[PDB]
Structure formats: structure tokens, C-alpha cells
């Protein structure tokens, strides 16, 4: 068992390093490009910031995990980290959702809109997404305590609360984002197909990756969590093999999930020719 935890620790260290470097570079280039006459996008900067915060919080999780699931730090760290991580993760997911619809609208609706109006719209959307992410994340930390750091929900209906929270994490966390992103990237692909000039410059094998990496990142984790919750409901028989399999699956898929943090810079900005040229210039 300790072998698995050590392997996951190594993977986490690698992910932390890569994500930190990539997000820092992206943010720096985004800040500096505005002096060269470019028009950088607010969503990319906010997404980079959110990924940077999650990566910064990873080390606390690694330290807690290596310590045989013990929690040496106090309750203050419990609350602060479980709040920061959740807020940043939800913000990143919501920005990935909003970015697809913005990209699609850029080719049809915003073709003849002055830059000032679209800039104002983008700022409003960014503020709204940040506020919504914080509001959705707050309840989880609202009832988090340590004594083993975990959540102690109200007893009278404790059962419901569990599933309650889970539903949100699958309804507003992965279901709707995937639905919207897939639908709007398919529509964008169709719109590019309709035109002829755009075909030569752009490539249709990048949008498919955009819409598939989300699944590759967040489907195993959610299915594992749903299996765990169903097990906690005693629907599945209680067995040592089953509990061990669930534990291993949850840990490995959690480790895989954070790859979502370090794969955004490589997928949304690095492959962009203009960004690469600007980076080489800088």
C-alpha cells in the first residue's frame, strides 16, 4: 500500500512543478503582451491564476497523504486549504465552460462589436464566474473540522447531506460544463466547416482534443466517487476486496485528476502560433 502512496507522491511533485512553471509563464506573457499591441483574453489569465492557486495548494495535500492520512496541522489550515482548493478548482472548471461559448460567439455574434463593449462583457462574466465559484464552494468548508480532518455534517439528516453535496459536484461540476463545451465546440466545428478560408488556417483535430481531454481528466474521478457513495449507502455488499479496490481507485483517479491543472497551458496557449512567437521574442 505504501508503494502506491509513494508513487502518487512522486506524480504529485512532478505535476506541481510542471503546472507551476507553465502557469507562471502564461501569466507573465499575458501581462507583458499588452504593450506589443496584442489583444489578450481575460479568461486565459483568470484560468492561469486559478490553476496556479490549485498547484500552490497541492503540497499540503501531498504532505497530508504521505503521513498515513494523518493531519498534523491544525483546523485553521484544514479550513483555509479546503476552501482555497475548492474555490480555485470550481473557478477553473467554470472558466473552461465559459471560454468555449465565448470562442463560438467570437465568430458569429462579436464579428461587428466594438472592442470596448466586448471587453466590458468579458470583465462582467469573469467577475460573475468568480463570485459563483466562491458561493458554490463555501458550504463544503462551512462544516469542516478536525479531530483526522474531515466534514461533520448535521446528524439529523446527515445521510442526505452526503448525497446532497455529491449531486452538486456532478450536476454543476462536470455534467453541465461538459454538455455546454461539447455542444458549442461541435457548433464551432460545423461553422468552420461551412466556411472555406478558415479551413486552411485552422485545424479540426485540436477542437476534438479540447473536448476529449475534459473527459479523460474528470470522468474516472466522478465515477469512482459515485461508486464510493453507493457503497456508503450499503447498496453493494460489504467486502474487503471491494473496499480495497475502491480505495485504490479513488487514490489513483484523484492523482490523475490534477493533471487537469497542468494540461491547460499546454492545450490552450502553447499550441497557439502567436503565443509561441511572442514567447520566443520575450
Amino acid at each position: 500500500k505504501s508503494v502506491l502512496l509513494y508513487t502518487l507522491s512522486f506524480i504529485y511533485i512532478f505535476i506541481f512543478v510542471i503546472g507551476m512553471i507553465a502557469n507562471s509563464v502564461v501569466v507573465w506573457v499575458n501581462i507583458q503582451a499588452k504593450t506589443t499591441g496584442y489583444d489578450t483574453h481575460c479568461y486565459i489569465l483568470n484560468l492561469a491564476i486559478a490553476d496556479l492557486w490549485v498547484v500552490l495548494t497541492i503540497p499540503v495535500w501531498v504532505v497530508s497523504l504521505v503521513q498515513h492520512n494523518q493531519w498534523p496541522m491544525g483546523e485553521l489550515t484544514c479550513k483555509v486549504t479546503h476552501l482555497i482548493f475548492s474555490i480555485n478548482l470550481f473557478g477553473s472548471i467554470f472558466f473552461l465552460t465559459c471560454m468555449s461559448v465565448d470562442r463560438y460567439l467570437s465568430i458569429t455574434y462579436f464579428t461587428n462589436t466594438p472592442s470596448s463593449r466586448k471587453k466590458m462583457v468579458r470583465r462582467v462574466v469573469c467577475i460573475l464566474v468568480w463570485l459563483l465559484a466562491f458561493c458554490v464552494s463555501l458550504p463544503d468548508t462551512y462544516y469542516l473540522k478536525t479531530v483526522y480532518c474531515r466534514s461533520f455534517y448535521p446528524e439529523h439528516s446527515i445521510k442526505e447531506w452526503l448525497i446532497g453535496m455529491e449531486l452538486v459536484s456532478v450536476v454543476l461540476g462536470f455534467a453541465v460544463p461538459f454538455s455546454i463545451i461539447a455542444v458549442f465546440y461541435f457548433l464551432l466545428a460545423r461553422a468552420i466547416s461551412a466556411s472555406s478560408d478558415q479551413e486552411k488556417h485552422s485545424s479540426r483535430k485540436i477542437i476534438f482534443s479540447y473536448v476529449v481531454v475534459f473527459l479523460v481528466c474528470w470522468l474516472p474521478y466522478h465515477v469512482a466517487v459515485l461508486l464510493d457513495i453507493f457503497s456508503i449507502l450499503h447498496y453493494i455488499p460489504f467486502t474487503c476486496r471491494l473496499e480495497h479496490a475502491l480505495f485504490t481507485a479513488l487514490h489513483v483517479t484523484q492523482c490523475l485528476s490534477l493533471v487537469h491543472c497542468c494540461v491547460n497551458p499546454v492545450l490552450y496557449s502553447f499550441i497557439n502560433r502567436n503565443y509561441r512567437y511572442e514567447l520566443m521574442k520575450a
Epitope: 496584442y38 489583444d39 502567436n274
Partner: antibody, heavy 126, light 108 residues
Framework: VQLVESGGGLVQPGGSLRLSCAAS????????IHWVRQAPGKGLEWVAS????????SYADSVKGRFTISADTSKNTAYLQMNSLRAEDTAVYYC????????????????????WGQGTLVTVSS | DIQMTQSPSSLSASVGDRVTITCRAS??????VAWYQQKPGKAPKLLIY???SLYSGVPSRFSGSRSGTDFTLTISSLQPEDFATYYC?????????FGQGTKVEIKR
């Protein structure tokens, strides 16, 4: 990109006209179409602009409420209809394309008109 | 409407001399400017788009810059084919407003 205008010709004051800019070599719906006007021996001026996809049109002050700009994607064409023309509208009209590129959505630049058609004199003389 | 002043109104420089044309806005426009070139009785061409980018096709002589709300077009060597009015456009705020233009003419 081979934008070409049409129409134009002597018109009695207060009449009406419909200029047509018919594009080619690309789909009109992925770029906005503007109309620029040049008075005889003077600087350029802006008139109207249209996005063929959902039709969000913005007009200039001197033509507000008089000039209507429409688009037809079934033929890659834009039409500017003008009415109640005054003596001050004598000019030459070009149609320009504000090129938009998707392959640089993340890190773009403030685009500008790049492909202009030829003139079409509009002599509003009684 | 955003008023865009342009100077000098009329230039006079012999072949090979440098040239500099300045465009002053009214409010702040963030790099949303362009410079064209209208030959006598011909459709204007796009020389510079955005703050300083060069439209693919123009010679490297033409270049642009930015300073707050003041933009400038600089030409190193004034070739004989570069004598024609140059206009200044801003795209940030509609309606789009052009400049007066700065006719460049032979010297003797």
C-alpha cells in the same frame, strides 16, 4: 478576396438607391462588412457596418435613420439602401472587410480593413 | 465620435529622406489604430494594422509605434512610389473616425 461594388449613378435629390457589394473567395458570414465614403477631394468617412451572421448593424451619425444595411449569405452579398439623399452625399463608396481569424482566438490583434473594392460614384445633382 | 487630429497637414520630402506622421486621439484607445495609403483616385490599401503590426505584403520600411494616446508612422527611406496621402483610423469606439491625411509631395 475579390470584393466588387455595383450600382451608382446620377440621382435626383431626395431619391433613393441601393448599392450592392458582392464578395467572393470566402464566406461573408465570418467577417464584418463596412461601407466607407470619400467626398470629392476630401478625406475618408465611415457610413455603416454589418455582421451577416446575426445582423448587428451600427451606423454613422450623418446617416443614422436614413441608411439601411442588410446582408444575404445565400449569395455572399451586402446591400446598402439610401433614401432622402441630400446634396452633401456626393461621394465615392467602397466596401471593406474587417477580416477575422479564428486560429488566433486566444491571442489576437485589433484587426483592420484590408480588402477594399473599387469606387462607385454617386452624383446627387438636380 | 472620437476626434483624431493628424499632423503635419502637408509634407515635402525628397526621395531617400525619412518621414514621420503623428496621429493624436481624444480619449484613450488601446492599440486599435491603423494607417492606410490612398493613391490618387484608387482604393486605399492597408499599410499598418493594430498598434505596430505590419500587414503581410508591405515593405519593411513602413513601421508604427504607440505612446499613450499618440501614434506615429515612420518611414526610413521615402521611395518614389510612396508619394500619396496616408490616413489614420481608430477601431476601439464606434463610429470609426479617420484622419485628415498628410499628403506627401515631391520637393524641388
Amino acid at each position: 478576396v475579390q470584393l466588387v461594388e455595383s450600382g451608382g449613378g446620377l440621382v435626383q435629390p431626395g431619391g433613393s438607391l441601393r448599392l450592392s457589394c458582392a464578395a467572393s473567395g470566402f464566406n461573408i458570414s465570418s467577417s464584418s462588412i463596412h461601407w466607407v465614403r470619400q467626398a470629392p477631394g476630401k478625406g475618408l468617412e465611415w457610413v455603416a457596418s454589418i455582421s451577416p451572421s446575426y445582423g448587428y448593424t451600427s451606423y454613422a451619425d450623418s446617416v443614422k435613420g436614413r441608411f439601411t444595411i442588410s446582408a444575404d449569405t445565400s449569395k455572399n452579398t451586402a446591400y446598402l439602401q439610401m433614401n432622402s439623399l441630400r446634396a452633401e452625399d456626393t461621394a465615392v463608396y467602397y466596401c471593406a472587410r474587417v477580416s477575422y481569424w479564428d486560429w488566433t482566438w486566444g491571442w489576437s490583434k485589433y484587426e483592420g480593413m484590408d480588402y477594399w473594392g473599387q469606387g462607385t460614384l454617386v452624383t446627387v445633382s438636380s | 465620435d472620437i476626434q483624431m487630429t493628424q499632423s503635419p497637414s502637408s509634407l515635402s520630402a525628397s526621395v531617400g529622406d525619412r518621414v514621420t506622421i503623428t496621429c493624436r486621439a481624444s480619449q484613450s484607445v488601446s492599440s486599435a489604430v491603423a494607417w492606410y495609403q490612398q493613391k490618387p483616385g484608387k482604393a486605399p490599401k492597408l499599410l499598418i494594422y493594430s498598434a505596430s503590426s505590419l500587414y503581410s505584403g508591405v515593405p519593411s520600411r513602413f513601421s508604427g509605434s504607440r505612446s499613450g494616446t499618440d501614434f506615429t508612422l515612420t518611414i526610413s527611406s521615402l521611395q518614389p512610389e510612396d508619394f500619396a496621402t496616408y490616413y489614420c483610423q481608430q477601431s476601439y469606439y464606434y463610429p470609426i473616425t479617420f484622419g485628415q491625411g498628410t499628403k506627401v509631395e515631391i520637393k524641388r
